[PDB]
Amino acid sequence: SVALVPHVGMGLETRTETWMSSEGAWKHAQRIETWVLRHPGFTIMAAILAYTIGTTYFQRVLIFILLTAVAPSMT
Amino acid sequence: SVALVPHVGMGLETRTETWMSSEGAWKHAQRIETWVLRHPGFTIMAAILAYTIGTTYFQRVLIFILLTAVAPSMT
Amino acid sequence: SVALVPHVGMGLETRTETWMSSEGAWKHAQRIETWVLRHPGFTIMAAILAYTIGTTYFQRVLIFILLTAVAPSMT
Amino acid sequence: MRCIGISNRDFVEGVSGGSWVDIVLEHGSCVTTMAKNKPTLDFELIKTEAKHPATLRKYCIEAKLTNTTTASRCPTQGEPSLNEEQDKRFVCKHSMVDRGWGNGCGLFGKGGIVTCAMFTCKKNMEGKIVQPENLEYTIVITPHSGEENAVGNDTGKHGKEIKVTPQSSITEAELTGYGTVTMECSPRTGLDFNEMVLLQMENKAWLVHRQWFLDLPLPWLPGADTQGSNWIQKETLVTFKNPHAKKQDVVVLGSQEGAMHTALTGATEIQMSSGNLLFTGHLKCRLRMDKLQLKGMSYSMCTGKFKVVKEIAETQHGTIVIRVQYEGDGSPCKIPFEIMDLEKRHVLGRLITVNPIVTEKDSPVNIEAEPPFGDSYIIIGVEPGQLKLSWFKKGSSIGQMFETTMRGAKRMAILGDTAWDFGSLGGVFTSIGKALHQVFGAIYGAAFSGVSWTMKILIGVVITWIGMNSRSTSLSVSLVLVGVVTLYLGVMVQA
Amino acid sequence: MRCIGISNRDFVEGVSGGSWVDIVLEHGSCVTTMAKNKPTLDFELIKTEAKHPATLRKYCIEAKLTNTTTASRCPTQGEPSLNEEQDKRFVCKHSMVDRGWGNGCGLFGKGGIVTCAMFTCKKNMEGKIVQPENLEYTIVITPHSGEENAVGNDTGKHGKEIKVTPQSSITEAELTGYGTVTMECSPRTGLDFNEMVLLQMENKAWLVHRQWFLDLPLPWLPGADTQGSNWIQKETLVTFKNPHAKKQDVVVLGSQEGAMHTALTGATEIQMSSGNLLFTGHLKCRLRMDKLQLKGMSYSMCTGKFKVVKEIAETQHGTIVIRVQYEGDGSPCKIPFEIMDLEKRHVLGRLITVNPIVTEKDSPVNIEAEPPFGDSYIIIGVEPGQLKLSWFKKGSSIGQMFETTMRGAKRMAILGDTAWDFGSLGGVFTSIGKALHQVFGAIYGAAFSGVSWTMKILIGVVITWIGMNSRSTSLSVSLVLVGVVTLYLGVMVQA
Amino acid sequence: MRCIGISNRDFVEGVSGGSWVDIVLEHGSCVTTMAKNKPTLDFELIKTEAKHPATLRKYCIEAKLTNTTTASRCPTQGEPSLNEEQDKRFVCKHSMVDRGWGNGCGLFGKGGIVTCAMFTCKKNMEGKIVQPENLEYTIVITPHSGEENAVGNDTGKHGKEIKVTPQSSITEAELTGYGTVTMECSPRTGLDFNEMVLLQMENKAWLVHRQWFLDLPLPWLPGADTQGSNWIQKETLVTFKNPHAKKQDVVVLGSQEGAMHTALTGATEIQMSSGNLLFTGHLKCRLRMDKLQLKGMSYSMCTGKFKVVKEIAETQHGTIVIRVQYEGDGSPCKIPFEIMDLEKRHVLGRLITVNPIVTEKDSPVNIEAEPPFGDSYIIIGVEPGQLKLSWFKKGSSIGQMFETTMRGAKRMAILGDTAWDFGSLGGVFTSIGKALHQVFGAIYGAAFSGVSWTMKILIGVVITWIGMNSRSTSLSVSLVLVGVVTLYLGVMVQA
Numbered sequence A, B, C: 001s002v003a004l005v006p007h008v009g010m011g012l013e014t015r016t017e018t019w020m021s022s023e024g025a026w027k028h029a030q031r032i033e034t035w036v037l038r039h040p041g042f043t044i045m046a047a048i049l050a051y052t053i054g055t056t057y058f059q060r061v062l063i064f065i066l067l068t069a070v071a072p073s074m075t
Numbered sequence D, E, F: 001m002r003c004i005g006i007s008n009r010d011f012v013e014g015v016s017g018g019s020w021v022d023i024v025l026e027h028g029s030c031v032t033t034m035a036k037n038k039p040t041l042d043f044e045l046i047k048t049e050a051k052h053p054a055t056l057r058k059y060c061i062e063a064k065l066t067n068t069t070t071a072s073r074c075p076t077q078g079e080p081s082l083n084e085e086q087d088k089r090f091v092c093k094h095s096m097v098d099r100g101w102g103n104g105c106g107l108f109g110k111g112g113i114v115t116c117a118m119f120t121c122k123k124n125m126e127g128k129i130v131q132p133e134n135l136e137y138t139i140v141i142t143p144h145s146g147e148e149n150a151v152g153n154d155t156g157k158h159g160k161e162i163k164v165t166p167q168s169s170i171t172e173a174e175l176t177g178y179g180t181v182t183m184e185c186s187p188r189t190g191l192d193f194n195e196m197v198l199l200q201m202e203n204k205a206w207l208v209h210r211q212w213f214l215d216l217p218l219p220w221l222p223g224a225d226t227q228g229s230n231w232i233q234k235e236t237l238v239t240f241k242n243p244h245a246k247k248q249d250v251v252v253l254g255s256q257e258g259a260m261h262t263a264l265t266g267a268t269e270i271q272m273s274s275g276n277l278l279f280t281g282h283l284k285c286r287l288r289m290d291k292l293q294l295k296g297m298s299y300s301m302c303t304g305k306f307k308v309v310k311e312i313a314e315t316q317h318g319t320i321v322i323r324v325q326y327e328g329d330g331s332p333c334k335i336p337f338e339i340m341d342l343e344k345r346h347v348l349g350r351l352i353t354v355n356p357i358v359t360e361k362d363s364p365v366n367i368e369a370e371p372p373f374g375d376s377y378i379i380i381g382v383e384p385g386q387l388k389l390s391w392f393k394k395g396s397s398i399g400q401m402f403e404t405t406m407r408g409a410k411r412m413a414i415l416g417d418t419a420w421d422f423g424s425l426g427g428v429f430t431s432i433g434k435a436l437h438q439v440f441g442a443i444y445g446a447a448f449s450g451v452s453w454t455m456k457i458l459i460g461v462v463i464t465w466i467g468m469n470s471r472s473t474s475l476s477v478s479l480v481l482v483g484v485v486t487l488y489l490g491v492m493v494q495a
């Protein structure tokens, strides 16, 4: 759908506020937070998988963050 | 938008075909491919970052996949 | 209540006497004393916790005083 | 015989002590059940209805703004006031605008501004909920009676269609000449209708997850309202624009019908137009064959000459069906039908039209059989003029086993626990497997909720790779098995 | 003459090149300025008035709920709806009450309930803010003319009242017989009137901090509001009761006037009825004594006898005031007044009413002088009938030095860095000290804002202990000094 | 004096050989330029217009399907065909249905089916494009004449508006009384309109990336199609449903206006009604001050009494603007105006309205000056009747330093390379910086195009951590620097 191609990082952004700046700023973060609240099971699985895959604690946190972000993002 | 929160993964699926199942089964994968095609620059940076972070080929490839998948969808 | 946020440490003080300076000077001290008298049980537990937590005697007294002051304060 | 010609056809063999078998009746599929000395019947779930629905909530997908007003205040002088802020039908927003001598103000700084517009809804998206007691399942039982037009007929005059309701557990239908069929269906456990909503946007309807429906980001009403003007999330369908920090504006932000259609991907459409007819889901029933009778039992064998009026046709499931006619006398007789080997020494085929009979002389009879793989002989009639017809069934018993295993895996992927009693005759193994499946499926559903099939495949691959590189084989086997199951589920999911 | 008898009185002595001296004027304090060849003057900032205020907000301190209504829905069927919730004049809350067959409902469970009631405000507190350019300070300048009934007189007609506004930086007063006195007060630095609110509640008003006023947890109004019925965060003045979870009720908390009086502890009260005039704060001024001459320096000395009409009395600051009566001829003459020792060898006193004169013969003249510590004698008149009055000052130069150091420390505690500007002649030492004080006071105000004096004492004690138990002899000294200063401020705060 | 009151006002000081300076003009922002002997001018870019736009594509946001037809084939007879399949206004779909004797087939299998429905668009969005040479930039130049009605005034009749086009990029404005100002602008290097599309949907228009517009997933026309009977991606606005193998039909999706509004987040909104008016983007011009001269510099000091008709009012940028009316003789005279200290022994601040003069004795003249951070006195007039205005500026020099640093960094973030031309005087350091930042910005845009701000934050954090944990300090420093810059850009993006 058109709604999945937000036209955000295209550049050509000037000092004037863009269309739906205030909302689109945090809409994705709100959506991810709502998904993480409504699907606590998958978050635990992602935490366990990140704990297993990554040796360095930074690697584990990075994998956990990426996996949690991509989980609802596909859906 | 409501489009960002589809009904996939709710667990109500039956034998009957769902709404826009065929019409939207590969849409996300095609979208990621189109985004990576139009934005080759970020894909290379993601590959380099994943290689640097990942101690093993599994961690590196997983991180690269997660970054490349999240970037278009988070867009 | 609005009374729990007094106009005390704002820095507008002058030589002129404030609204309830004399009355409010010792109100909190006397209220703490009354609370200690009424609930001596918590004071002994606070003393024990301060003795256990703090290594230096100065730390012990500081923690004891902080607990005794905060107990009524959160009340 | 309404099953003949359906790709999603399941054959159920045998009955438990007490002459009962429990089956799962999915929509779009039919179950053909057969048992020793019992007529072969076809059961199909053809309709589901929810009655007396209640409105949980209304969303606004199309809006319109009017009566826009704006007010401002000088810097440091507080916030502007509009009399419209008091009304809840106005969408109001506070921002800051540069003020100064140019703007007619004495100070120089950001002065507050407020813009209010009236939010009117133009197109609603109602969401309804029905109690599980108001379901009315409709089922149609069609005996393999061999009528000429019954071979695939999906109209009436061939089967008896009954209604399964939570009010009465026992549903009986008296099939003309076949006795009485008794069904004990559990309509309450079929679909969680107290965890689902009947969404209805314009002329289409969808059966959506209740929490997913409640989490939609659109203006909405409680559904108990009688006025229809106090929308709650009005600011999810309205934009306030402050382009250059000098004035504020409001726009109504288009129509959300297309976005809703995109967001409803993964849900199954339903016919809420008149009655809330659902054409999806299953229904587990316990068939009682105790009162069933063979239609042709107590008939003499047909000793006349039979003729073929429609050549053997092979079904998707390997079972042939042929139409024949009778020429001899003693018309109310039963057809001598066998599937012999090429030497005509062993009876290899299994008859699905369990007791073929000739009710009328001038009326073709349809017979469905299950010839063995390879070369066979369909012999119809008695020796003086019997029709011995050669048929070849391409396939293999190993192929049959693999296809049956894949069908069972697909069924368990669709129903989970409920698939363990599809053709279960009680049994200790069946109960143990159902309990194990309940526990493991609860864990899996908790761990894989709201995740798309691509993420399912990815997580399955990651778990598989972790199991393949583990040290302890006790953990590795379990992890690889979980990963393979997850990969299969991701491959089959989203249908 | 108006400054005699005030507990807070400062003596500003001497001037710099150009004949100006820096003085800070306070409402409760007073200043007497002395210089060579120039009359002694008394200064008192007697009034501060803020004009043309604009309300910043309007809090509610007493409300009343009416037209209460409630509604509910069965469990699992969403939220209830009330038309009253459309209007923001009604305070509404949602809660669930267990429902069932006895509650007229179909199924059992927690059912939502909504209660609404009209919120009316009957008593409100209005907080007004003023522009610094709209301030007007009144200063009274009174020379030590030594007139009858002029000592410590507040009525008026003895000095000249000059109004100081930010519009003009040069204020000019024409004292008859003394020339003109030039004032260059700086209202902008006196008190941030764009960082504090003039809150009036009922018949009393306070000068409060702006952010503190904006942080009050009470139902408020924008202050630009005209309708005055759309209150915000009403829930802080009403409670909703659901004791057993069977019905929900809303009641109004009660008058918040007493809680507001308790919250205002530490604020300085002002008169906001019939004028926004507030008698608190300070005003730095630069007085210029050029164009200022003594009165009656051409009169000849009084060749007559003076009879004492009011026996010597010592002021709180050691300055004796004596009233005398002249009886001889040549009425408009100079009073011969000196403070010698027993033998009259050398003058010890320092006449503060410079050049005392007797304008009218029947008018007593009350001269003020500053005797020395110990025995001294006040000599009035010529040898025939001369008065030799003894006196004992009862103090030490060390005692007065300690007292003045304490007074200066207190002024530093009250005036912050403006203390360095009191009695200043533009020295480099004073300027460097003022810059250092500005930096240190900025850091200290950042670190000790919003903390009670008890917390000040605790912090001072802790920091003193840390410093006195540190290894470094430098860090120890600095920390102990900081702690002692903090302790002093805590002891000398809340005034 | 139009730049007074704008929060994005910025100051340019100095000129180069030939008395020129490069300035970047943005629509929101206003630029005030100061030169040693030149009058102070205010530059604002008030309008960008695109002329003779040409459509690039028409997209369908709402469609309707009609004339549905279906065709079906037997299980093994191959795919069916419909006449409409050749038709470009019909949208078709091939699928397979369960077929057998019941359907009227005569053979059991998955027969093909094809359904076609006529596509007709209802609402579209026209993606117009414009050639770069058709852009026109309107710039308004207003000198600091001190006219009373000129402070923050935008109604008109105060300055001069010069229209700039790429063909005529050099233009001269005759500022009556102040000489002539020449602008050597560079429109072609601003927004690159060969890569930008004017997207208009209903009555709202946005400026979008052209490749983004071309990649949109909606049916589209070539742009020159008057018939609208060949839509290219009808598959995206229709859905073919085959729930159970038996039937196939097609339904069109809902209005996509709402989906587009979400897809347009991050696109600046333009006006495309009655001219393609853009109020977005910047313009870089070269200001030529050679022929620009001060007005009334051959006048004489007023030597008269002034009155303040508008009080001192500090602006958002630390400057003060006052309005004084003249009362004395010698009308056309220079206004004495200094910002000195209390003793008038030092000059602390400059004035921005250089050479304030009195054109008419009855016309108030308003001056803008930039006082220091401490206490400063705004002296106006000569000794007899002089008026000294006290003032106090809240900021601090370090505060101003880092505020200007942040402002410059933000300017670099938005304009990139063009930020090095904002106050450039043709230096060598400026050119080296611009070349370096061109290379780095090209690399950064290549490596960060199409990425969200959250992803920018995450990547910056990863890069900064890699630098923070690295063996080579050189690479460590470079990576940490890149990470901090990327984090700042992510924080400041989405303006």
Ligand SMILES: *[C@@H]1O[C@H](CO)[C@@H](O[C@@H]2O[C@H](CO)[C@@H](O)[C@H](O)[C@H]2NC(C)=O)[C@H](O)[C@H]1NC(C)=O
Pocket: D149, D153, D154, D155, D156, D157, F101, F102, F103, F104
């Ligand atoms: C399904 O059965 C119906 C009978 O109910 C068939 O319709 C009959 O067709 C015959 C032959 O033309 C007529 O003589 C009957 O009068 C019809 N009866 C009715 C009730 O319509 C129908 O043709 C069958 N369908 C198929 C595909 O064979």
Ligand SMILES: *[C@@H]1O[C@H](CO)[C@@H](O[C@@H]2O[C@H](CO)[C@@H](O)[C@H](O)[C@H]2NC(C)=O)[C@H](O)[C@H]1NC(C)=O
Pocket: E149, E150, E151, E152, E153, E154, E155, E156, E157
């Ligand atoms: C303060 O000064 C006023 C005015 O000089 C004094 O008021 C005078 O009082 C006497 C005694 O009754 C009257 O005869 C005068 O007419 C009053 N003058 C005025 C202007 O009212 C007042 O007594 C003085 N107070 C003190 C304590 O010295």
Ligand SMILES: *[C@@H]1O[C@H](CO)[C@@H](O[C@@H]2O[C@H](CO)[C@@H](O)[C@H](O)[C@H]2NC(C)=O)[C@H](O)[C@H]1NC(C)=O
Pocket: D101, D102, D103, D104, F149, F150, F153, F154, F155, F156, F157, F158
């Ligand atoms: C901007 O300037 C215009 C003049 O070009 C102002 O309009 C005039 O303002 C004066 C001042 O009161 C009036 O007497 C005139 O009647 C107005 N019209 C004309 C044609 O002169 C305008 O007011 C200015 N803007 C602001 C905010 O003051």
Ligand SMILES: *[C@@H]1O[C@H](CO)[C@@H](O)[C@H](O)[C@H]1NC(C)=O
Pocket: D067
């Ligand atoms: C809205 O506007 C119409 C006409 O402009 C007017 O009749 C009506 O009273 C207005 N209503 C409100 C709530 O402002």
Ligand SMILES: *[C@@H]1O[C@H](CO)[C@@H](O)[C@H](O)[C@H]1NC(C)=O
Pocket: E066, E067, E118
């Ligand atoms: C509130 O109740 C009183 C008492 O009947 C009635 O007169 C008044 O109209 C009511 N107002 C509202 C707004 O309900």
Ligand SMILES: *[C@@H]1O[C@H](CO)[C@@H](O)[C@H](O)[C@H]1NC(C)=O
Pocket: F067
């Ligand atoms: C579409 O249907 C209308 C209905 O009358 C008909 O007139 C028209 O010819 C049809 N067009 C086709 C089939 O292309």
